[PDB]
Structures are given as structure tokens and as C-alpha cells.
DNA sequence: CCCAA
DNA sequence: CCCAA
């Protein structure tokens, strides 16, 4: 069944921010499997406990973008997420009209690993064929995106996009009103915005934006969208302006607006990908496959010169993930001679850009971690700069690399981790069990603060301490006991 | 008394978005005088009526910025604004700690016209002296502003900035909790964001940001702020980075974050103003005053060439209000020979940029508006462009110019105004009284929609129709009757 | 003096 | 094939 696949995707595969297909933003130690639909069905049925504050807060995660910009990802509290996932699954025969959208390329799908929503899984060549077919006969292309799409979704516009704005306002129950209420309860009983990273909020965004896709399709516009990004192919510049006007109208019906910084009109024929994609791919040492494994093992000079050229291209243009794409080009084709030099280049670059920190794990097996103690200082310096820059992706990834490889962590960097106080870093330190007393003092300060939302911001840490029998449940409800009794661990071992 | 000056400023001078000192965004026909303290004290006392929806919506206004970007200004519903203004004033001895801030340049003050808050009233030479004193001995400057400051203020952070975050969370009444509640009721019972344009929300932003200013001052940072823009002067680059880190920390305590697009570090000595300010002022025809009125009357060639050079500089740089500054340089020094040519240039430019539409009224008296009917087509074409571009400042300003000068308005652009459906343009058309039936159909559709927030979005139109005895009060409360009985007109004549 | 924020 | 969005 496909409805069951929705349930398993919502709980076990796309509860955490696992939407990136190439490499996960969150380290693989955190996971959402062994969170079975029966367990969420039990949590939703539970009525025990009482909360003074309406709604729930979410575990916060700050991931660096390509330009070192913070992006806010959220891990929803399992009570609110369990109710939301149950309500989404129980009415998928009313919701699955977002599956049959030809203008939304990123949408729920029945993937092999189990996830419904994977960002850029269709790859650039199937994208190339479609882009070539759409671009034919048109001499203008429009790139326009919503300004704050996930962060300013009006939750009360969830019923509207289901049944029309006017009919829903006149009717002021229906399933989409309850979906509105559950999406509000997921984030502090707040109508504006949705959490970023779970697939329930991406489902909500698909539901809202599918009405705009429908009323743009009915006017005969040939357009595609990737979440919030609309690309349009117009024979005339006038039809391009008319598309921008109609998109503004239909988004303003749902309290949404265009990002006019990124909204631009270009003259076809333009590049199908970005420019630096083609510049890196013509200069790539691995752009030709020789079908024998010895011939495509790159020497040290080729990888070093390609990485230097990629650094120059990223500095000169700065309009995309030049370094991410470049190191993902040449990291699997190395031989054992240049493994250490490339690892040193990656260490320097991953200090200078935290986004390149997850790549180290693919070369961390071949590099001898002990060596002359130098790599311990490498990882501790990276941890210190991750604490200062208040980034969560690189900091948690570096904790994962230090713990998984038995690399010691200094006390001063533990103290500035404490000062940073991001939830998943503290969950990793909790999993280390060395710093149990300092984690105990931190969660004790959270407890004596007496704020429900501050406990909800670290529910993952509190539940992980409960699962190893090191802390009582801060909540008076039985959701944590239901999760523990049925075997839910968000740091599972093999 | 200064408290009484606060109350008159809140109701009669800064209820509407009147913070711009050079020229108002809103046309002079809309005004907030004859809304005295006694009427607001009566409306706050009124308990009659019932509303199904908590909170109030606000009259929406979309003003184009220098780069044609829409900025959302809001006119708060007079019940919510009257309660909010009464609560702000009744505790000004607790609130006026924002007056004694030396880092907030734009703040409440006792001005001559009566407004508490005027943006850029100090002028650039008093700013020049202070900027020169601050910039001395420092070789780096930091420009960092909050990303969505007014739109993403958390209302529940209003108690925190009064009494500390931890003390307010432990206490979870105090006056700031009620100020929280009233600021929420001003905008749809929503904790996120404040309306833009009234001085109550600017007072709220001062209250929130003054704690950040205090904890930035205590570390010895020499910095200034203009609403949300922080400028800092550092002897070293590391002091600049440390200021950025501490500012990020103290804003993140209040769920606030920097705009890292506009956050940039420059090397002193940089210019006190922008670059194009200096290029326009060295090339200005009026940069020297000859103290006799005949000698500084500019000929046609000087003004035309200065405006063309300004158009070129605005096209080439595009980093500020080049055209706004340039036309405000040379518009008062014209003689009667070049008045019509400058009006034609302003008409073309004001069609191409709506922000230059308010200037036309200073040259609309000398030019014969009848002429050979051409100016009527000018204004109607500008109106159609304003309705296409969904801007409210230029559209309402052009309505003001057409109505005030007895200029006829075509029916097709009236229908396109109704299709746009901005509130203040419809208030002006209501004031014209020619289009009473179409306005009646529009507000009748709003009434049969049966939504409280859609009536609150056009409360000004509904009250203006109620004041001329052309429509009943949509609300069951007596606030409109209190305002009508005591003589409140938001379109008053002299 | 004449903008913006 | 190997990014982002
Ligand atoms: N790991 C994930 C999971 C989900 N999303 C979602 C949230 C974003 O809203 C959407 C794509 O939108 P943008 O990245 O363009 O971001 P915004 O719309 O929030 O802002 P802006 O237009 O200012 O960049 O993808 C994401 O970015 N990253
Ligand atoms: N006529 C008025 C009255 C008030 N404000 C307020 C609201 C704005 O939040 C604040 C200054 O902030 P910015 O103009 O820099 O705008 P934002 O902070 O909203 O956004 P961004 O940093 O993206 O420009 O001034 C304004 O801009 N214009
Ligand atoms: Mn966007
Ligand atoms: Mn996008
Ligand atoms: Mn800002
Ligand atoms: Mn600003």
C-alpha cells in the first residue's frame, strides 16, 4: 500500500531533516527509525498530562548555506508530530492531489530508501531533457521564488487551498481545519510559518502551492517549480511580466509574496545549469570514464589543481556551491597516495567553510587518525570555530567524527559547546557519556527555568537522557514512556 | 506635559504612517487629527459588541522603495490602536527609558509639528559631525541590520526586554504583559511581528532593542543605530567580528537575527553618506547659494542635464534613492520658464518610478492642468501602471492629484482600481462620490463574505462611508458611533 | 538641507 | 551523477 509507505516515510525516514539526498545535513547517528506507526498511533491516543503553554516548541538546528547563511531547521516534538503525521496519513485520499502535479518537481514519491521527499533526486540529466523540451520556442525565462516561503506560510490558509478561500471563510469539522490546528500545535500554536526539515510541513507547502500551480496552469503557462522556485518559459517578454503578475496575485491570495531579489528575467538560450557547473565540469579531472579502475585514479597534482581552481571559481563568482560540487566530483576517484594531501586540503577548507565538514567522513577511514596528534588539534580547532560561528551542521558533524573515531575532545571546547547550547551537539555529548555532569547541569538549568517551550527546544536531549535512565521525564504526559516501552531510540546502533 | 505630548503624537500625528519627514508616504487628504485623547479614552472604556475572531486586522498599504520593492505599512484598527495608545501612555514613566538612549538616533522626541518619531529629521550635517567624531581613531566600520526587524518581532519578547528574559519566563499582571497583549490585538492576535507605520510599534521596537543597546554599551562598543541598522566603529577587524558576534547573541536572545546581505565591513576612511550623494552634490546646479533670488533660479538646460545625469547615475549604481534626492535638490529653485519641461520629465520618471509621484504636487499649481487634455491621459496612464504594479503609494497619490485638481478619471482604470482593491485608493474614490455604487458593491461583497478580518482590512473605507451616512456600521460595537459623535474624520477639509 | 534606514 | 532550490 502507498498510504502505509506515507506513514513509514513520515515517521522513520523524513521526521528528521533528511531531505538532502547526496549527504544528510544531520549526522547519521541521529535517526528516526524504530519510530513505528503503531507507536505514533499510541501517542496520538494518549490524553494524559497537562501543559500550561499551548502548542509545542521544536528542536532548533542552524545549517550553513553555500554563502554561510544560517538556515533554520526544526525537529518537531514527537507528540505534535505524531498527531500531525496521523492526521496527514488518515486523509491521504483527500491530500494526494499534490502527487498528481506536473508543475511541482519536488513532491512526495515512492522512493527506494523509503523517503517521500528528496531534494534533487531526479539528477541533472533528466532535468536537462525536461529543461530542453520546455525551453524550446521561448526566448525569455523567468526565475521567481517566494520570499520567506516556509517561514511565512499562514496556517489558516491550509483550509483555503483545500476548499477555496471564499468557501472556507464562509464556513467559518473539515479535515484541513484539523490539519491547520495540528500544524499550529507543531510550532508554539502559531499561524505564521511551518518547521523546516520534516516532510509534514513540505506536504503542507505542497497543499498550499498546488492551488497556485492549478490557477497558473489554467491560464496555459508552461512553468515548473522546485518547492518555492518557479521557472517559466515565455515566447514574449510581455507574457513573462503577465506570469509574474498572476503569480503575485495567486500568492497574495494566500498571504505570500515573491522574492524580487531572486526574481529575474533572462534571455534564452541560457545555461541549463549554473555557469560554474559547466566551468567545473569542463575542467574536471574525472569528466571522462575510461571503464578501467586504474586509469581514472587521479594523481595528487590533478586533484590539488582542480581544488585550487575551484577555490578561485568560488571566490570569483560566489553564486553557488562551487566547492561542494567540486569536491563531490573528485572525492571517490582518489588513490591512496593523495588521500592524506586531499584530507589536509579538506580540513583547511572545512574549517573555512563548515558545509564541507561532512565530506571528511568518506576519507576519515583511510587517514590514520592518531598520526602525530595533529588531527586532534585539527578537529578541536574546527569545533571551536563552529562554536563561535553558531553553526549546527558543522559542529554536530565534527562531534560525530570525533566520537566515532575515538578522538579526544578538549574541556575548553566542551565549555563553549555548553555556551552555544545547540540541542543536537548536546545529544552527541550525552551519547559520549564523558560529559554527563555538565549536560546534567545544563538540563537542570532548563528545568528550573520553568518554561515549557525551553524544554521543548531540547526534548531530544531530555528523551535521550531518559532512554539511558539518567534523567526523569520533564513532561507529565506518558508520551516518553510510550516511546521508551516500545523501543524508540534516536541514536540507534547497528 | 511630555506625557500629553505623547498622547497627541500617538493619536493625531503618528497614528498614520507619517514617519517620513521630507514628504509623507500617505497623501495629505488622509489625516489623523480630530482624533483627540478623549475619544480614545472612550473607545478603550467601551465594552459593547462581540467578535468571533480574536484580534484585529489592519488597513494594508504597499509602498514602493527605491528599488521598487514593496514595503508593508499598516493602519491599525482604532479600537485596538486606542487601547494600545492608552496603555503605552498610562505607563510612560516605565517606558520612557527608550528616550534616554544615546545609541538610538531615531527615537521618540518632542518635535515642533507634534510627532514623536520622524525618520531622518536631524539632517546630514548634524549626522556628519557625529559620524566624524565616531569614525576617528578607528579603521574599520560595520554595517549590520536586523533581517526582518518589524515583521519578525516576537511580541512575547516585550516583557523580557523590560524585566529580563529569565525573570519574565519565571514569572510565567505587569504592564508590559498587557502591552504584549495589546500589541497582539493590534495585528490579528499574532505574536510574530508588529504593524509598520504607527509610532506605537516603533515604541515597541525601541523597547525591545534598547536592551540590546544596553548590553552592547556595557562592553564598551562605540555604535549607533537607526531603527534596526547598527553602525560600529572599530580600531581592529577582530573588534568588528566580536561586535558582530555579540550583536548576534543579544538579538538571538529576542528571536532576532542580522541581515547578512546588508551586513558588511568596510575600511575607514569611508564616506559619511553614500557615494551617489557626493556625486549628485558636486554636480548639483544649486550647490552654491548666491543670496539673491534671481541668481539661483536655474535655467532649463541646467535642470534637464542634472536630471539626465541623475538618471544615468541611478541606472549605473542603483544603490540608493538617487532620483529622489536629485529631484528634491532642484525642484524649489525653478523659474516659470522650465516649470512645464520639468513637469514633463517628472511625469515620465514618475510613471517609470512611482516614488517620484508625490513630487508632482509641488509643480501642479503652476502648470495649467487642462491644457490640451494631455495631462489627463498622463495621470490615467500612471494610474493604470500603478494598478498593474500593485503599489499603493503612487496609486493613492495619483488619485489625490486627480481629485484635488478636478481631473477626470476614466471608467476602465476605475474598474482596475477595484480589481486591485487597495483600501486607501477606495477611500479616495469614496471621497470623490462619483463611484459610490461600485464602492457600495465592493463593500457589499466584503460584507457577504462574512469575515471579521476582511472588514478590518477596509475599516477606514467602512468608517468613511459611515461618516457620510452612506453605509451602516459593519461592527456591532459602538466605537464607530463614538468616533462619529465626537467628530473624527480621517479625510478632513481645511 | 533637501535620501534611506 | 555527484550542487541548489
Ligand atoms: N533541508 C531543507 C528542507 C526543506 N527546505 C525548504 C524550506 C525553504 O523554504 C524551501 C526553499 O526555499 P528557499 O531555500 O529559497 O528559502 P526561503 O523561501 O525561506 O527564503 P529566500 O527566498 O529568502 O531564500 O525549502 C530547505 O530549504 N532545506
Ligand atoms: N515608513 C516607515 C515606518 C517604519 N519603518 C520601519 C519598519 C522597518 O522594519 C524599519 C527599518 O527596517 P528595514 O527598512 O531595514 O526593513 P526590514 O528590517 O523589514 O528588512 P530588510 O533588512 O530585509 O530590509 O523601519 C519603515 O521602514 N518605514
Ligand atoms: Mn524563497
Ligand atoms: Mn527557492
Ligand atoms: Mn532590516
Ligand atoms: Mn535597516
Structural overview:
Chains A, B: InterPro entries: RT_dom. Chains A, B: It holds the Pfam family RVT_1. Chains A, B: Residues 1-311 form the Reverse transcriptase domain. Chains A, B: It comes from Salmonella muenchen. Chains A, B: This is Reverse transcriptase domain-containing protein. This is part of a larger assembly, with 2 copies of chain A (494 residues). Chain A has 494 residues and is α+β, with helices and mostly antiparallel strands. Helix content of chain A is 50%, strand content 8%. The first copy, chain A, has 23 helices and 6 strands. The first copy, chain A, has helices at 2-13, 37-45, 78-90, 92-95, 123-135, 157-163, 165-171, 175-186, 199-217, 237-252, 275-282, 300-316, 322-330, 339-352, 360-363, 374-389, 393-404, 411-420, 423-432, 436-449, 452-456, 459-467, 479-485; strands spanning 59-64, 70-75, 140-146, 223-226, 229-234, 258-267. Chain A has a 4-stranded antiparallel beta sheet, with helices on one face. In chain A, strands 1-2 form a two-stranded antiparallel ribbon. In chain A, a hairpin with a 2-residue loop joins strand 4 and strand 5 (229-234). In chain A, helix 2 (37-45) crosses helix 3, helix 6 packs antiparallel against helix 8 and helix 19 runs parallel beside helix 22. The longest helix of chain A is centred in the middle third of the chain and has 19 residues, at 199-217. Chain A is globular, with a radius of gyration of 24 Å. The relative contact order of chain A is 0.13. Chains A and B meet through helix 7 and helix 10 of A and helix 7 and helix 10 of B. One 2'-deoxycytidine-5'-triphosphate binds next to strand 2 and strand 3 of chain A. Chain B binds 2 DNA strands through residues 22, 65-66, 106, 119-120, 123-125, 145, 225-229, 262, 273-274, 276-277, 280, 286, 320-322, 324-326, 328-329, 331-332.
